[PDB]
Write an enzyme that holds these catalytic residues in place. Structure first.
Site, short mmCIF file in Angstrom:
data_model
loop_
_atom_site.label_atom_id
_atom_site.label_comp_id
_atom_site.label_asym_id
_atom_site.label_seq_id
_atom_site.Cartn_x
_atom_site.Cartn_y
_atom_site.Cartn_z
N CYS A 157 0.86 -1.18 0.00
CA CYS A 157 0.00 0.00 0.00
C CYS A 157 0.90 1.22 0.00
CB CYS A 157 -0.90 -0.01 1.24
SG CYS A 157 0.04 0.23 2.83
N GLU A 186 -8.32 8.65 3.54
CA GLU A 186 -7.83 8.54 2.17
C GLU A 186 -8.76 7.86 1.19
OE1 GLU A 186 -4.44 6.11 3.46
OE2 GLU A 186 -3.14 7.84 3.09
#
Length: 153
Positions: free
Chosen positions: A37, A86
């Site tokens: 990620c 996010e």
């Protein structure tokens, strides 16, 4: 809001790569999570960002990343109050080379059967990163992860 991405990597045999974040990581250090990620660069595509981080953290090459959860968004707070909000599209891909671990990012890893990882996530979600759990619990995303467990010759 911040832009990010998450990726789940599988090998040709269909095993899933789970990783443990290094103790030096600013957020969620020492936590077990999905493969990789990160965050894309100003004018970089999400797909290229996945490829770049897979090379940086795991020193591995991958097949074209497949979008499995484009609308994933999350706001989670780590153990010392650090908060993250996010837009985090999720991808899945197959590794095409051997791993070469960057210990500044990854402190441990395991090749496992997806079925077992999902059972663990469902039974003890607290033992994993919150985004790994939220992503794996989405019905549509889970179906795509299952598709990557097929043996690929």
């Amino acid at each position: 809001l911040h832009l990010a991405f998450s990726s789940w990597l599988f090998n040709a045999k269909g095993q899933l790569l789970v990783t443990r974040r290094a103790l030096s990581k600013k957020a969620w250090p020492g936590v077990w999570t999905n493969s990789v990620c990160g965050h894309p660069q100003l004018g970089e595509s999400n797909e290229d960002a996945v490829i770049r981080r897979c090379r940086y953290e795991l020193g591995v090459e991958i097949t074209p990343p497949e979008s499995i959860y484009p609308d994933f968004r999350y706001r989670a707070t780590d153990p010392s109050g650090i908060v993250e909000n996010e837009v985090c599209p999720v991808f899945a891909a197959r590794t095409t080379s051997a791993l070469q671990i960057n210990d500044d990012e990854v402190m441990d890893y395991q090749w496992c059967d997806l079925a077992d990882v999902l059972h663990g996530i469902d039974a003890t979600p607290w033992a994993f990163s919150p985004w790994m759990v939220m992503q794996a619990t989405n019905r549509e995303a889970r179906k795509r992860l299952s598709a990557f467990t097929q043996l690929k010759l």
